[PDB]
Amino acid sequence: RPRFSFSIAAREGKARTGTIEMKRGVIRTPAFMPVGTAATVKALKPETVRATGADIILGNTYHLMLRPGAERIAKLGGLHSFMGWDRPILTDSGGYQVMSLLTKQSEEGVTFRHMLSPERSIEIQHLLGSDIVMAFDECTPYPATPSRAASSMERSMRWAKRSRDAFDSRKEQAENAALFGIQQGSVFENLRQQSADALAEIGFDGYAVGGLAVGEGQDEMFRVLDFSVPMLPDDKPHYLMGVGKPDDIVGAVERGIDMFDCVLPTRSGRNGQAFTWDGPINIRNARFSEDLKPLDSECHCAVCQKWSRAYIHHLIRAGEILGAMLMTEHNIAFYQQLMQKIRDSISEGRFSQFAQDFRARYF
Amino acid sequence: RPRFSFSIAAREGKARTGTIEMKRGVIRTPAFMPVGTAATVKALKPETVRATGADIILGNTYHLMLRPGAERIAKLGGLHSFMGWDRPILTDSGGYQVMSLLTKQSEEGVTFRHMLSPERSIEIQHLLGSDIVMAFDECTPYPATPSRAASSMERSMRWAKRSRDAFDSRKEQAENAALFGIQQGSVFENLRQQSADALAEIGFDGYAVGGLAVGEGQDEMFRVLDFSVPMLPDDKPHYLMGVGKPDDIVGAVERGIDMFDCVLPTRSGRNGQAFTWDGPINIRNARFSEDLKPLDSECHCAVCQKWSRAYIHHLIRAGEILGAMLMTEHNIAFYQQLMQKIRDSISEGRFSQFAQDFRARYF
Ligand SMILES: CNc1nc2c(CCNC[C@]34C[C@H]5C[C@H](C[C@H](C5)C3)C4)c3nc(N)[nH]c(=O)c3cc2[nH]1
Numbered sequence A, B: 001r002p003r004f005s006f007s008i009a010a011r012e013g014k015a016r017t018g019t020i021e022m023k024r025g026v027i028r029t030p031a032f033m034p035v036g037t038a039a040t041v042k043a044l045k046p047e048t049v050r051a052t053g054a055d056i057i058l059g060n061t062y063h064l065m066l067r068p069g070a071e072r073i074a075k076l077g078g079l080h081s082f083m084g085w086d087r088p089i090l091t092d093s094g095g096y097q098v099m100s101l102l103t104k105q106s107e108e109g110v111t112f113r114h115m116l117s118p119e120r121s122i123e124i125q126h127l128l129g130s131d132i133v134m135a136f137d138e139c140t141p142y143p144a145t146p147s148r149a150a151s152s153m154e155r156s157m158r159w160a161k162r163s164r165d166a167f168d169s170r171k172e173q174a175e176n177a178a179l180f181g182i183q184q185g186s187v188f189e190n191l192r193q194q195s196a197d198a199l200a201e202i203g204f205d206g207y208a209v210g211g212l213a214v215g216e217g218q219d220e221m222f223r224v225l226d227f228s229v230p231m232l233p234d235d236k237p238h239y240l241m242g243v244g245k246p247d248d249i250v251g252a253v254e255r256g257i258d259m260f261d262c263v264l265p266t267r268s269g270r271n272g273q274a275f276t277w278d279g280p281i282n283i284r285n286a287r288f289s290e291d292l293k294p295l296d297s298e299c300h301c302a303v304c305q306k307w308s309r310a311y312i313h314h315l316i317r318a319g320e321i322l323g324a325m326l327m328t329e330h331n332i333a334f335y336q337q338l339m340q341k342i343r344d345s346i347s348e349g350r351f352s353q354f355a356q357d358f359r360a361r362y363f
């Protein structure tokens, strides 16, 4: 396999389905990437994550640099060996924590004491042995004034160039990993354009839409996606960072997005929320106490083949670890099944009908 | 398979190895039974528990009657269907909580508000669909004066008769399940004898040694086992309740015990203690932070085939669920491997040498 190749096999409107080939495996797109902070997809063994259909998982610079440490993970053989996942890994750069968290910021980077800069972030991702490296950016807070959004975005573009140069200066990283740039600009079309232009001028293997799912709501997110994704190079993958609920994903795919990551299936699962084709349910609710049906009626996952809502209701109410294990496996499988249905419907030219059918039932 | 059959295949001294055949499967003895309070072996799927080699698991009247409720579990199909374990299940009767916990006691039973009595305990075990039912007893506290130990023991024997009669009066239970009586008497030989005599006069399918592992220490426990186990019928299984550390198990087998249950491999695992043939280790200790070896060098479990001490060290320190999953799988597998080595060494007539070798290395 090559270091990186994206090929588009079918289109419907702005939607695309295809594959990313990398040394450690193939990624079917549109793709959902389960996430983790501490070198684990919470409550799942890697083999379980792979069984749900995930092709790639996501890790993060900020948390792994604190614990167990990037240098430590490299001494131990890298992240793949450490956690036992041998397929591609994408790592975020720390740029969302630049917003979400404790800091002193400057053009050099951000101090948290721990420092992150374009160079340090790319170095940490190298030490982890990430397959897809994210540029170090600033997720602009929402709302932002145009002036502030512009200043933030411009800094991110300078950081994007520094990220590219750091990555290219490390031959092993440049020969075996991919680098994605991240578009900023808040909700403003001209800033989004300026950012896309800067990023394509630098040149990346893939392009993320950053700065969304930060409180603007779905309607505004979709409005921004409407003009922002066509600004990105068509022939490279488009990654929407931190999205989202099943209906967010469907709409985003309709607007040209190829890749997604979100804590929702994992986190929500441990809190008792199960995704179903009839919408989400909270398994802790008393109405499930004697319900022998599986979480979802059509789901193919191992949890729905064997255990009832009633049992899982009990496990979550009792604070049992197996409750979190089962809910998480189901929700990740659900998400993977959603992505499969999306890929199949685009390849068959019936995605708009699927999106319609999906929404009528889910809502 | 019959309702219940115990056959002894080999002996060495007081030690025995054999099988218990029941409708839901065969149990190899000496046996270790993983336990749970809430219709789960904590942090493990049933299939994982079975893969470690367990033939039978233990549940408990007291906790399941509180949550999710015995009647509820029966409405849902019984414990086996509910939790997804189709092999035998032994249930304790609530008698240890009579000691360990909130109560008003009388000859009728104990109020906790929830009531337990011989009749109610046996009924709950029926509703759960337990394969091996424990008589409802009182675990005498330690230390106890001879007078108090006797009074307690006598009440337990009256409760044992009531337990037998309740069990026999329910034809489905009597035809498909087994009933074990529990010997009391504290540390006093004459009371232990009186109790064994009472229990054999009633007649049970198996006999438990109750009232130990309640703070007397190993030396005293062994001294009591020395005279107490030969008081029990030789041709029925001998179950030591709530024991124990690997060396407790080896010594108890040397004194004629066939069956064991303990929270240690599960609980200790979630707290960071791993069992190894070189003794227990606390994986949280900094000395393991960069240790690429598995938990144990010889263990056959899936965790030792794939992950390092370093990774599991990280998981436990980070409070990750997968840390508890991995530690628990390993410790239960370890315990099952110990039992296999014990069974093999008795069947080959080299158990005393194994016990010796085991202790030299473990300590
Ligand atoms: C929620 N909406 C949202 N997320 C966003 C992220 C993080 C993506 N998820 C990774 C992450 C973040 C947290 C939570 C988990 C694990 C680990 C820490 C990595 C996912 C973002 N990351 C970067 N670098 N830049 C953004 O603009 C950005 C915008 C986001 N908008």
Ligand SMILES: CNc1nc2c(CCNC[C@]34C[C@H]5C[C@H](C[C@H](C5)C3)C4)c3nc(N)[nH]c(=O)c3cc2[nH]1
Residues within 6 Å of the ligand: B035, B036, B037, B059, B060, B092, B093, B094, B095, B096, B134, B137, B138, B139, B140, B182, B209, B210, B211, B212, B213, B214, B241, B242, B243, B261, B262, B263
């Ligand atoms: C620790 N030493 C010890 N245990 C003992 C138990 C409980 C066995 N384990 C079941 C149990 C108990 C707790 C903890 C887990 C799950 C569930 C609740 C069932 C194991 C005992 N049970 C009964 N009926 N009688 C005893 O004399 C007795 C003595 C014990 N001495």
Ligand SMILES: [Zn+2]
Residues within 6 Å of the ligand: A295, A296, A299, A300, A301, A302, A303, A304, A305, A330, A331, A333, A334
């Ligand atoms: Zn499912």
Ligand SMILES: [Zn+2]
Residues within 6 Å of the ligand: B295, B296, B299, B300, B301, B302, B303, B304, B305, B330, B331, B333, B334
């Ligand atoms: Zn092991």
